């Protein structure tokens, strides 16, 4: 399927506004499980539940364990670019 590049702008006091599940230890990609109303992902648009996150800010998430992805994702700030594909 199509790999979309999706932009999200986040203030430092805000979260991304997504929940993720999956990861290498489960044999699946990092997958979006929820988009939280009113937070940056919802406001900015373009992400959806069931998307596999292939990269964030050019950092590859394809073979990451869940906790690794949580770390990388949580460290991104400001203007953030996701690369995602719906699975």
């Amino acid at each position: 399927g199509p790999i979309r590049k999706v932009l999200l702008l986040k203030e430092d006091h805000e979260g991304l506004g997504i929940s993720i599940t999956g990861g290498k230890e489960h044999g699946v990609p990092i997958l979006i499980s929820a988009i939280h109303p009113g937070q940056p992902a919802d406001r900015c648009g373009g992400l959806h539940v069931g998307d596999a996150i292939l990269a964030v800010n050019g950092v590859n998430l394809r073979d990451t364990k869940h906790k690794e992805a949580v770390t990388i994702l949580s460290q991104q700030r400001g203007e953030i670019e996701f690369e995602v594909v719906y699975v």
């Binding site: 991304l16 506004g17 997504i18 993720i20 044999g27 499980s33 869940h66 949580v70 994702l73």
Partner: peptide, 10 residues
Amino acid sequence: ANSRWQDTRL
């Protein structure tokens, strides 16, 4: 394949 996956809000 695991039946249980963590789910983390970010």
